[PDB]
């Protein structure tokens, strides 16, 4: 049957009598329909109708399946490797004729960008009550958290992104820091990631602030400006007990980083300060890890060795170390009273999976439906997240290695601490959920590009709609029933692999049970 089209869709191929290889229930005949958004497949030849639709954004390689010399019962065809933990195998026949052209054009709107394309963000014409982009207001944000007062101040020095052009247009530092001073430090951090505020206790003022590695390469060199900095931040606070310093990274990364230019604040170079590792692998282990997940649980899981072979992959180790590097954030803010400063060595991956799931942690408000939205679009957006680059919308290299799933561990992060604490959230799974499998469809403009700067160049909030748009315009299907009940306004889930559970719900969603 006809694929039901969203405003600004249309088809651009179809094929007849194309095959669906499903691993669970046989192969099925029907209409194979490709439109500039999805793919769809709809057999009538079931009870109810068997349908498959999948958003092209999912799709990573398009493979042709057998060729010529192929005689076998449908094993002439195409499978789509997708995003999705899962691939799609259809067959067709030779004498249709309608491989290549399924072929073809399954490689030209799953992958718009590399031919000229605008992704279908751009041609998504619905429109919502509510308006998804007026949802985050930076200076307000900060309001809420009582920023600016006596000891944080609001900079403009970045407004043009001149001091860091991937950080936002407003920037929180401490009061006593003057602009030609940030330029300093500017020199000192990496990309000109500079610390900056994050997070503020609302009584104690311990601060949260990220920033990405010091340049303090093979030879100790330091910056005055940046010590100061750090000084600052700790003169900030009343129980100005020394400051903590949490690099995401595994010490002999950190290590290697220093051998090429980079590195980690010393004993020496920062005497008030204490620095912990938290041995958080890179973008490149994670891809790896993900990979190794999917090949155990899909399409079929081996149930004799499960529990040995998940833990061959690492999955949940790796949830796990960024669960407790994040606790350890909260816990020194919260109970110790001690202000924290973030990094990695971009500051943009791990640095953002840390400060972000660390104030879900300390701050309610970011547990509500709007409140999560603003975490989302404050530290990871606006802060400089690389969606663009680590998912590579509408991009055929599949082979990308700045490709890994970053915001999904995060995701992932936060689920777990859904079931840890079924009332203390707002929203529900199945808000998580749509938020992952937008993160790759490319339907609204919320996830696309790769820093705040460039979304104001590319125009979003008039180009494309917020994913926010669609979401709180239907929040009874977002909304959790038992949210309202936790008094307590500090979440600390366990990070073992006692506690943390295999989130069935997303990696294994496709088996008909």
Not at 23 to 28: E, K, N, S
Not at 186 to 209: C, K, M, N
């Amino acid at each position: 049957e006809e694929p039901p089209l969203l405003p600004g869709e249309n088809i651009k191929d179809m094929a007849k009598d194309v095959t669906y290889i499903c691993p669970f229930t046989g192969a099925v005949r029907g209409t194979l329909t490709v439109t500039n958004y999805r793919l769809y497949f709809k057999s009538m030849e079931r009870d109810p109708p068997f349908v498959l639709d999948a958003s092209l954004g999912v799709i990573n390689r398009v493979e042709k399946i057998g060729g010529a010399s192929s005689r076998g019962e449908n094993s002439y065809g195409l499978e789509t490797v997708c995003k999705d933990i899962r691939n799609l195998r259809f067959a067709h026949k030779p004498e249709g004729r309608t491989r290549r052209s399924i072929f073809e054009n399954l490689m030209k709107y799953a992958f718009p960008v590399s031919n000229n394309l605008p992704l279908f963000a751009f041609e998504y014409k619905e429109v919502f009550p509510e308006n998804g982009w007026k949802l985050y207001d930076p200076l307000l944000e900060y309001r809420r958290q009582g920023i600016p007062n006596e000891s944080w101040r609001i900079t403009k020095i970045n407004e043009r992104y001149e001091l860091c052009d991937t950080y936002p247009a407003l920037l929180v530092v401490p009061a006593n820091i003057p602009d030609e001073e940030l330029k300093r430090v500017a020199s000192f951090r990496s990309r000109g990631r500079i610390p900056v505020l994050s997070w503020i206790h609302p009584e104690s003022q311990a601060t949260i602030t990220r920033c990405s590695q010091p340049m303090v390469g093979v030879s100790g060199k330091r910056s005055k400006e940046d010590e100061k900095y750090l000084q600052a931040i700790m003169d900030s606070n009343a129980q100005s007990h020394k400051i903590f310093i949490f690099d995401a990274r595994p010490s002999v990364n950190a290590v290697a980083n220093k051998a090429k230019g980079g590195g980690y604040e010393s004993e020496d170079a920062y005497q008030n300060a204490e620095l912990v590792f938290l041995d958080i692998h890179n973008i490149h282990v994670m891809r790896e890890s993900l990979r190794k997940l999917k090949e155990i649980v899909y399409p079929n899981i081996e149930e004799t060795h499960w529990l040995s072979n998940l833990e061959s992959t690492h999955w949940l180790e790796h949830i796990k170390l960024i669960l407790a590097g994040a606790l350890r954030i909260a816990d020194k803010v919260e109970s110790g009273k001690t202000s924290v400063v973030v990094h990695s060595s971009d500051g943009w991956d791990r640095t953002a999976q840390l400060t972000s799931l660390a104030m879900l942690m300390l701050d309610g408000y970011y547990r509500t439906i709007r409140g999560f939205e603003v975490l989302v679009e404050k530290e990871w957006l606006s802060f400089g997240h690389r969606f663009q680059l680590r998912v590579g919308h509408g991009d055929k290299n599949h082979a990308d290695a700045d490709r890994s799933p970053v915001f999904l561990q995060f995701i992932d992060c936060v689920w777990q601490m859904t079931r840890q604490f079924p009332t203390a959230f707002e929203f529900n799974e199945y808000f998580l959920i749509t938020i992952l499998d937008h993160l790759y469809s490319c339907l609204f403009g919320t996830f696309l590009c790769n820093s705040e700067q460039q979304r104001g160049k590319e125009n979003l909030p008039k180009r494309t709609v917020s994913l926010w748009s669609y979401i709180n315009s239907q929040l009874e299907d977002f909304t959790n029933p038992l949210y309202g009940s936790y008094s307590n306004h500090v979440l600390y889930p366990v990070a073992s692999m006692r506690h943390l559970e295999l989130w069935v719900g997303y990696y294994i969603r496709w088996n008909p049970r």
